[PDB]
Amino acid sequence: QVKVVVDRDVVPTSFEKWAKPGHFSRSLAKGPKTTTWIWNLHADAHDFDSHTSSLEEVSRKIFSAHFGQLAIIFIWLSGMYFHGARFSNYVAWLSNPTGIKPSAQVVWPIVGQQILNADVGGGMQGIQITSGLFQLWRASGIVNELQLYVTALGGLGMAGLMIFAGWFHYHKAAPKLEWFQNVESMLNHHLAGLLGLGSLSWAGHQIHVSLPINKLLDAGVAPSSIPLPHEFILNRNLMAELYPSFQQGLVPFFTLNWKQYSDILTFKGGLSPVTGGLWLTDVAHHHLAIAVLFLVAGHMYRTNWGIGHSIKQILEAHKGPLTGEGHKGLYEILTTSWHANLAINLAMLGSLSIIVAHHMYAMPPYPYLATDYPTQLSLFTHHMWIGGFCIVGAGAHAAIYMVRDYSPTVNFNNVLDRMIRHRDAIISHLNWVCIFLGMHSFGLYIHNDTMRALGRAQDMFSDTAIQLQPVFAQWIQQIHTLAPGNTAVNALATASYAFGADTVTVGSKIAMMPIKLGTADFMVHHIHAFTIHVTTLILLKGVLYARNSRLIPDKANLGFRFPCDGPGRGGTCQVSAWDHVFLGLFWMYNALSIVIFHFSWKMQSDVWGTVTSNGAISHITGGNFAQSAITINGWLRDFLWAQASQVIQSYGSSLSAYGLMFLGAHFVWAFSLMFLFSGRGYWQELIESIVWAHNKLKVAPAIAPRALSITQGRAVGVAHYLLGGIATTWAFFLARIIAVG
Amino acid sequence: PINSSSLTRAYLSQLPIYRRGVSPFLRGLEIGMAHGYFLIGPFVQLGPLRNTDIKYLAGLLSAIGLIVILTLGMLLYGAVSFTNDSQDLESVDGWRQLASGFLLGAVGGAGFAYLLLTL
Amino acid sequence: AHTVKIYDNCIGCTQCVRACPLDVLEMVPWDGCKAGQMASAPRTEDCVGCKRCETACPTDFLSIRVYLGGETTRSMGLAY
Amino acid sequence: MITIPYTIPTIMVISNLVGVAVGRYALGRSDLTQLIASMCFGHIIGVGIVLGLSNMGVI
Amino acid sequence: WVTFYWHWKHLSLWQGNVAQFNESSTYLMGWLRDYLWLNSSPLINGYNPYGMNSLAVWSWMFLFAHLVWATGFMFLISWRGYWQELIETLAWAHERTPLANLIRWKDKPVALSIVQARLVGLVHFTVGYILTYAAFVIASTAGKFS
Amino acid sequence: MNLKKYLSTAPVVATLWLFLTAGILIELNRFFPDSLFY
Amino acid sequence: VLTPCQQSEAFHKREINEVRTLENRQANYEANSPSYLALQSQIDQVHKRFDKYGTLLCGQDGLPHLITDGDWRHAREFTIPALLFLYITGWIGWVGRSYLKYTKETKNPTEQEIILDVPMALKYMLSGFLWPLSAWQEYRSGQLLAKEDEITVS
Numbered sequence A: 001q002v003k004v005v006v007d008r009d010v011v012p013t014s015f016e017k018w019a020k021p022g023h024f025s026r027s028l029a030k031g032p033k034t035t036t037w038i039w040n041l042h043a044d045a046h047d048f049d050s051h052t053s054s055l056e057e058v059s060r061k062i063f064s065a066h067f068g069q070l071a072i073i074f075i076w077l078s079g080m081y082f083h084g085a086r087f088s089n090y091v092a093w094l095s096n097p098t099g100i101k102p103s104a105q106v107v108w109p110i111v112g113q114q115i116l117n118a119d120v121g122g123g124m125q126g127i128q129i130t131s132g133l134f135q136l137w138r139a140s141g142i143v144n145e146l147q148l149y150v151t152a153l154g155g156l157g158m159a160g161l162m163i164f165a166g167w168f169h170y171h172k173a174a175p176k177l178e179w180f181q182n183v184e185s186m187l188n189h190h191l192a193g194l195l196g197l198g199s200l201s202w203a204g205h206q207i208h209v210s211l212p213i214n215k216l217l218d219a220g221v222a223p224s225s226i227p228l229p230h231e232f233i234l235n236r237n238l239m240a241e242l243y244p245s246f247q248q249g250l251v252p253f254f255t256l257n258w259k260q261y262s263d264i265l266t267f268k269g270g271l272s273p274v275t276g277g278l279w280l281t282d283v284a285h286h287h288l289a290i291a292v293l294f295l296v297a298g299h300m301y302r303t304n305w306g307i308g309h310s311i312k313q314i315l316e317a318h319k320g321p322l323t324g325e326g327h328k329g330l331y332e333i334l335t336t337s338w339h340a341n342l343a344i345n346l347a348m349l350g351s352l353s354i355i356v357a358h359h360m361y362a363m364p365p366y367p368y369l370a371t372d373y374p375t376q377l378s379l380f381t382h383h384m385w386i387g388g389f390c391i392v393g394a395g396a397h398a399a400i401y402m403v404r405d406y407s408p409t410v411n412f413n414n415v416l417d418r419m420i421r422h423r424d425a426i427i428s429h430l431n432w433v434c435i436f437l438g439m440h441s442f443g444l445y446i447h448n449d450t451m452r453a454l455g456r457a458q459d460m461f462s463d464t465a466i467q468l469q470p471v472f473a474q475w476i477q478q479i480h481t482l483a484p485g486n487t488a489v490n491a492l493a494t495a496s497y498a499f500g501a502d503t504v505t506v507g508s509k510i511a512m513m514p515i516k517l518g519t520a521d522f523m524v525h526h527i528h529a530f531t532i533h534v535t536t537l538i539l540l541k542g543v544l545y546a547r548n549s550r551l552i553p554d555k556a557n558l559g560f561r562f563p564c565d566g567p568g569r570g571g572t573c574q575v576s577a578w579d580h581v582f583l584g585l586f587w588m589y590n591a592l593s594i595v596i597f598h599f600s601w602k603m604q605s606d607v608w609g610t611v612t613s614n615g616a617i618s619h620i621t622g623g624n625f626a627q628s629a630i631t632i633n634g635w636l637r638d639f640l641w642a643q644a645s646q647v648i649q650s651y652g653s654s655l656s657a658y659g660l661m662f663l664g665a666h667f668v669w670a671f672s673l674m675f676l677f678s679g680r681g682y683w684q685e686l687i688e689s690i691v692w693a694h695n696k697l698k699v700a701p702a703i704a705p706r707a708l709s710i711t712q713g714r715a716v717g718v719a720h721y722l723l724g725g726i727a728t729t730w731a732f733f734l735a736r737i738i739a740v741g
Numbered sequence B: 001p002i003n004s005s006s007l008t009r010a011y012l013s014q015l016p017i018y019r020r021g022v023s024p025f026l027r028g029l030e031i032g033m034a035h036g037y038f039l040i041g042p043f044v045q046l047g048p049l050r051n052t053d054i055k056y057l058a059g060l061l062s063a064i065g066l067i068v069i070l071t072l073g074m075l076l077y078g079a080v081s082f083t084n085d086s087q088d089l090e091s092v093d094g095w096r097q098l099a100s101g102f103l104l105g106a107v108g109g110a111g112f113a114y115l116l117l118t119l
Numbered sequence C: 001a002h003t004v005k006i007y008d009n010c011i012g013c014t015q016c017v018r019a020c021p022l023d024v025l026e027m028v029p030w031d032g033c034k035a036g037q038m039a040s041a042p043r044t045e046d047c048v049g050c051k052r053c054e055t056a057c058p059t060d061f062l063s064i065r066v067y068l069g070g071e072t073t074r075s076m077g078l079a080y
Numbered sequence D: 001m002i003t004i005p006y007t008i009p010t011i012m013v014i015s016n017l018v019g020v021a022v023g024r025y026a027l028g029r030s031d032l033t034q035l036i037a038s039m040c041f042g043h044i045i046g047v048g049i050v051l052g053l054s055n056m057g058v059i
Numbered sequence E: 001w002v003t004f005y006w007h008w009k010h011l012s013l014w015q016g017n018v019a020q021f022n023e024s025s026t027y028l029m030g031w032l033r034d035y036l037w038l039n040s041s042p043l044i045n046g047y048n049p050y051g052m053n054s055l056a057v058w059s060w061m062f063l064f065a066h067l068v069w070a071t072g073f074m075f076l077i078s079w080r081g082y083w084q085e086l087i088e089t090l091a092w093a094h095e096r097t098p099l100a101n102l103i104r105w106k107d108k109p110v111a112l113s114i115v116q117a118r119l120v121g122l123v124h125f126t127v128g129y130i131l132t133y134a135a136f137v138i139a140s141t142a143g144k145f146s
Numbered sequence F: 001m002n003l004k005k006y007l008s009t010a011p012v013v014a015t016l017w018l019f020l021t022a023g024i025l026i027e028l029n030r031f032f033p034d035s036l037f038y
Numbered sequence G: 001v002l003t004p005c006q007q008s009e010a011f012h013k014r015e016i017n018e019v020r021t022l023e024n025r026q027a028n029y030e031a032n033s034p035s036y037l038a039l040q041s042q043i044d045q046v047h048k049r050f051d052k053y054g055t056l057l058c059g060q061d062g063l064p065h066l067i068t069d070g071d072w073r074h075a076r077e078f079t080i081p082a083l084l085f086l087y088i089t090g091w092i093g094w095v096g097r098s099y100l101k102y103t104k105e106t107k108n109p110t111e112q113e114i115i116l117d118v119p120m121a122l123k124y125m126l127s128g129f130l131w132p133l134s135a136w137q138e139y140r141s142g143q144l145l146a147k148e149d150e151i152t153v154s
């Protein structure tokens, strides 16, 4: 049944245990006799299934910690609304968006760095936004500074409700585990209550705010003659002029004459030719479809009223012959082990963020988003990168399930461990697919590299040479051309203008051009399938060989973050289920580095740029992809040598901070290698040879100065390899596209 | 266990090794009779001499250029491993007759493919 | 073989034998310590050399010192 | 929505009664939630039939 | 750093603009801008989709030696026991497959021990490093002259 | 009562000293900018 | 040859070029824009920047070089902030050494280093002001150094 039992006055709220660092771990409350206690203090700050095995106390800790995370997010969005309010040129940006570059952050005038304040127009300078906040505010209908101030102060208000909520839900009203293992109610309220009322209420905001406002701004009204969203609901008369179905009220809704709501809601697709964004009639209609569809979706989980499913009777019913037991056990796995839930939710969250990137470049949903190309780039790139990292979090927390929370009694002959019976046949065929795709994704590049270098360009893989025209992608893209007349019957335009008709231009800037895919785009998709399969190899090898390998048959007895076993078996460095995640972060850097190096160079050759008189065309590199992506000298020369030139000449100007975050990120990238290659068997008596020089001058530190441990001494090589490696492409990309677009 | 069924066994059991009794020169001559017809293929359409009228002869010379390396590695494998003289494929003499069968049957398959690029 | 040698610092606390997942190490009654024990390594033919013993050797400095010697099938720990 | 002659509420109560006819079967207890669940299902079906009947052909 | 410094000194003497050095060598974008980005222009144009010239060997060696220098990092960073528990998967995949389990190894497939692993990562690091810089010295000075 | 012990720890006093000397550098470089003499 | 910097040609070329180059953005605004006042303050901070580098030595590069010989004409260039700096991290180093030889003799020296005893810390922070003739007089007692500490095999 469903009932909420809540402990009250769980933990006293004095600052006493803040004076005891490492109070939480009895393995770590001994105090630092060495400096490894300092880093183990932070490596055990959130090992919640290592504090105490009692899942009640753990579950209180995590559920209260989420409110801390949402508190930091409301401080973050209240920060973005205040930097939109006081510091941004958003009010002036709302007048002419295609001329004024978006800027919020206005750099304080200290030595030199006042030159970072870019005169982006609007009469007021500051460093240029690439996050695209102004496009979401024009979409959301924020008119003047007042809604940015007020929505910022409401952001701090919700931040106070999340700090007070998390304090309230760890200390003075914290629930039991029976509240938490009541998971049909949790899905029942997140499908329906969170996402259902979220999309429904957001359809309320778009119909009663954005459709009148972004009809008026689509008509080009200055941001003074625009009435407040306030004034559209005192009377329907200001909206019946704009959309004449508001005159009928809700009466055609309750009589189901929904043909009448073609003014407010429609299915057109394509893009607005005036603003370069999606039709907010289509977007508001869309959030109604998520509204009714998710409120349908929420009510399939029996909680108290004996109507709905339980997950147990679903997973038992799929008792397939080739698995034997069926899915028996997974409702007991996913309601007793948090790390498995974190594996699933980080996989689907990360892949959702990748889906977000791919759906934002080709269907740019905000007005004047595809006009300013840096906000179009970096919202592909950023969501691609967190969309990467969360999949490695799936590959880690799946293994953290498999090491800690695996129990073969509940998990006996089901769908799960029958994989692990033939995990040699899993990982071996991933090994084969990785070699086959590596040959047939990169050997083609060494081929075109040699044939172009050997002069015989007749033997390359270009359109002129031995072609590799992608057949399937061009065919289904041709289906997407033929959607809105044939199959999407009530549509007008296609799903995007990456598919079908001629390009959409706003302010002589190409918003979206139909992307052509020939014989170079092919091979880069096989790069992506390749380096996706390698991360899948390391992150399934990290899970199927997590608990008990055939090399080391007791890894659960060693743990998750153990470094190794020893020099035995000829050396067993880097063998834990954590160490595969260590590897999958480098392959994350590889895979996404060539995803965005496909994105930011195919769409600087095939989509973006300007249009001139008589509708004539001009790309940024000028069609320089298919003759140049086929090689690597074309890739490195014509992309990394040529697109760097606006990052490198950026000194003396407002783009020079990217000229600093470019070199410094090469420094951090290069600085990771010191941690990756060496190890603490060097640094420990290098350091102790310095401890002689402190013992001579009586400057012996009382906390004994060890070197780092092994797993920290490689985790930090990841976290510098990625910070420097990611911030190189960050500074390169924003300094490339701000310098032109 | 799985992919170990009677259709698996009935397909593998009549392959040109797992079949019961064939002389090793013919046992390898079947292997070369397949593979020599095979390896002419990916040198005619995609080879470097597909532009002149040596589209078909370069498949012969290049493919036998592979086959000498293939039988050479066959002689290395039977030279190093398979030391005993049980006279079958697990021997020296039966393996080198398996390799010689693969060579002569492979060159014969090369000539058969070359004379079937006529039609 | 990976030659395991067990010196006269071995005060017989038996975290070595409990730490060895190969049973190369056993305890021998040796009247030279307080526990009367001193570890022995008779079966070093199965000794991997993973040095899991030397981690759990709470002597002054490593009564049991593993020297990496021969590399057989069993001492390399290959499955096949 | 018109009166007693054939209209959109005419083709709704048949969906409601076949909905509760499902509610006699899908754990067919005679409680409140047979009607609140099952009249809701036949309500969903009726809404799927009314306007899906409106687009392709006569209402 | 020695030969980068010498080479960017004498590329400023031989071209003549020593003022190009002395004003733009005391900061790091002076090196990466004024030396590596500018002086790899005749290197990296070593062969185009338009054609090639005599420096295509040095640009092909250039990209080649970046590949050597990055195959070093597969051994230096990613150490053994990953591959020691992955060669076991390949050995299962060959022991279990039909038509090829006849062809069985004599020397058993074992991942490289970490005395060797850091060595071969070191060797690809040197070969990639030194072939990259011997590509760049000769392609650069052969491109600005001759 | 024991908050002042938390405000005596290593990272907090590290921020309350490097924040302070950081403010010495910035406030000493707004008042006297471009200071290469002396 | 290091010319005196106030008369070097390329120096004043950089004066005209940077005042004019930064001045090019100043005509993008009206006479009472806040940015226009900010670039007024910035032009002031460039003419002051180039007048306050008058007694330096900018050579043919037009960039002010330095001299680290202790020529006593270049003392404000290098040696005065040299002695100043050595005083400052002699302060810091003597504070840290004095605090470690405090916490070496306490109850629990481990907990002393996480939680700094801000009473005794800010005692030693301020008391370590005269480290030449206090560290030197603790050196003459044979107490700054040590002997027979830890070492490896030989």
Ligand code: CLA
Pocket: A063, A066, A067, A070, A179, A180, A182, A183, A185, A186, A189, A190, A192, A193, A194
């Ligand atoms: C329909 C009701 C409802 C709603 C709206 C939510 C919403 C949420 N839950 Mg949640 N939950 C619910 C019922 C609900 N839950 C029930 C019934 C259970 C028990 C089975 C849980 C158990 C649960 C867990 C275990 C966790 C969440 C978490 C979350 C948050 C996910 C983060 C997010 O999307 O940020 C978007 C943020 C918002 C949309 C702001 C939402 C704030 C509005 C005002 C709704 C909150 C109303 C509040 C729940 C009513 C409490 C009653 C009380 C005041 C008397 C989100 C706020 C996760 C989290 O982050 O913890 C907080 C988490 O770990 N929930």
Ligand code: CLA
Pocket: A430, A431, A434, A435, A436, A437, A438, A439, A442, A443, A446, A534, A537, A538, A583, A586, A587, E067, E070, E071, E072, E073, E074, E075, E077, E078, E082, E086
């Ligand atoms: C640029 C350097 C580099 C290169 C080439 C590779 C290549 C490879 N890595 Mg890798 N790796 C690298 C750096 C590199 N890595 C780094 C820096 C890390 C640090 C984290 C890793 C970590 C890593 C892991 C963790 C794993 C790999 C794996 C693999 C293999 C994937 C299968 C494949 O693509 O086969 C195709 C091979 C190629 C594309 C290489 C080029 C081959 C050309 C095309 C053909 C042959 C050339 C020529 C004809 C040879 C004959 C001539 C010669 C004999 C004289 C592949 C060989 C995986 C593995 O074991 O295999 C599945 C694996 O699990 N790597």
Ligand code: CLA
Pocket: A439, A440, A442, A443, A444, A446, A447, A450, A459, B042, B043, B046, B047, B048
């Ligand atoms: C791995 C990627 C790759 C691929 C696909 C190719 C492909 C090609 N290269 Mg090549 N090359 C590569 C990498 C690659 N190269 C690299 C990495 C280098 C540098 C080391 C070179 C250097 C190079 C040179 C220098 C030259 C070529 C040339 C060629 C062409 C002819 C070669 C030939 O005869 O093929 C031989 C093919 C075979 C022997 C076939 C074996 C593979 C078959 C198809 C496998 C089939 C198995 C089957 C599917 C099993 C399932 C069915 C079964 C169960 C029944 C061909 C297009 C030549 C040329 O002129 O180009 C036109 C040439 O001069 N290449």
Ligand code: CLA
Pocket: A689, A690, A693, A694, A697, A699, G092, G093, G094, G095, G096, G097, G099, G100, G116, G121, G124, G125
């Ligand atoms: C108690 C303060 C203190 C003192 C007096 C010294 C003194 C010395 N260190 Mg040092 N050191 C310290 C802290 C200190 N160290 C810390 C915290 C670290 C870790 C980052 C190091 C790391 C370190 C290395 C790696 C090396 C030295 C070396 C040396 C010697 C040469 C001088 C030098 O270059 O310093 C080096 C100075 C630094 C690396 C940076 C300074 C460290 C911090 C930032 C300042 C210390 C202030 C301290 C934290 C204040 C705390 C007390 C206060 C709160 C009450 C000299 C005896 C070298 C040696 O052996 O030469 C013979 C050598 O190679 N030290």
Ligand SMILES: CC1=C(/C=C/C(C)=C/C=C/C(C)=C/C=C/C=C(C)/C=C/C=C(C)/C=C/C2=C(C)CCCC2(C)C)C(C)(C)CCC1
Pocket: B033, B034, B035, B037, B038, B104, B105, B106, B107, B108, B109, B110, B111, B112
């Ligand atoms: C796709 C597919 C497939 C595959 C394919 C293949 C695998 C093929 C093969 C085929 C082949 C591969 C063929 C062969 C041919 C051959 C023949 C028909 C024979 C004849 C004979 C010969 C060649 C002879 C030779 C010679 C000469 C000429 C002279 C003297 C010497 C000798 C006798 C050696 C299958 C069916 C599985 C299934 C379905 C699908």
Ligand SMILES: CC1=C(C/C=C(\C)CCC[C@H](C)CCC[C@H](C)CCCC(C)C)C(=O)c2ccccc2C1=O
Pocket: A674, A675, A676, A678, A679, A680, A683, A706, A707, A708, A709, A710, A712, A713, A714, F014
């Ligand atoms: C350099 C290096 C070290 C040495 C790193 C040292 C131990 C850490 C240096 C940074 C710490 C944070 C210095 C401590 C200083 C304190 C922060 C106090 C300073 C005062 C203020 C800054 C607060 C390793 O321990 C190591 C381990 C394994 C593989 C490679 C390596 C490795 O390459």
Ligand SMILES: CCCCCCCCCCCCO[C@@H]1O[C@H](CO)[C@@H](O)[C@H](O)[C@H]1O
Pocket: A247, A248, A249, A250, A251
């Ligand atoms: C046969 C008699 C039918 C009478 C039909 C009346 C239709 C509307 C029913 C509700 C009456 C009030 O109408 C509302 O008016 C408000 C504002 O006054 C708006 O919500 C809508 O117009 C109606 O809902």
Ligand code: SF4
Pocket: C009, C010, C011, C012, C013, C014, C015, C016, C017, C039, C056, C057, C058, C059, C063, C064
């Ligand atoms: S040596 Fe160390 S570990 Fe081995 S027994 Fe004596 S004490 Fe226990």
Ligand code: SF4
Pocket: A568, C004, C019, C020, C021, C022, C024, C025, C047, C048, C049, C050, C051, C052, C053, C054, C066
């Ligand atoms: S060597 Fe490896 S196996 Fe032999 S004892 Fe020491 S640890 Fe146990």
